[PDB]
Nucleic acid binder design. Structure first.
Length: 82
DNA sequence: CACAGTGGTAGTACTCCACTGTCTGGCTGTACAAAAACCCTGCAG
């Protein structure tokens, strides 16, 4: 009664093309939007804490500081080797 | 006549790298005293 002529995009996508793409990419969910998205949280705080702050320079120093946040070289240090 | 921020800059200001001698302040052995703070005992109510 609820699926006669209508199906949500995802229910179809998840019931149809999943085995195929898992066969092809080798895996999925590692490729998820999550690794992006989450980052958005930072973009908010880096727009307050670390912002300049004026419209001109703001994107510049957010972007820079973000890049610095992402780098491995630093995280290596912050592990403190156990 | 909020307030506590917000990063880059250019400003200023201070404080550092070699060459040297010279200075005062400070330590080590025991000897030499004068203060330091009791508690004695001594002499007195």
């Amino acid at each position: 009664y609820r699926y006669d002529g209508k199906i949500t995009n995802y229910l179809h996508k998840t019931l149809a093309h999943v085995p195929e793409i898992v066969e092809r990419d080798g895996s999925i969910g590692a490729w998820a939007s999550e690794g992006n998205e989450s980052g958005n949280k930072l973009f908010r705080r880096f727009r307050k804490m670390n912002a300049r702050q004026s419209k001109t320079f703001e994107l510049e120093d957010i972007l820079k500081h973000h890049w610095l946040y992402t780098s491995k070289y630093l995280q290596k240090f912050m592990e403190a080797h156990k």
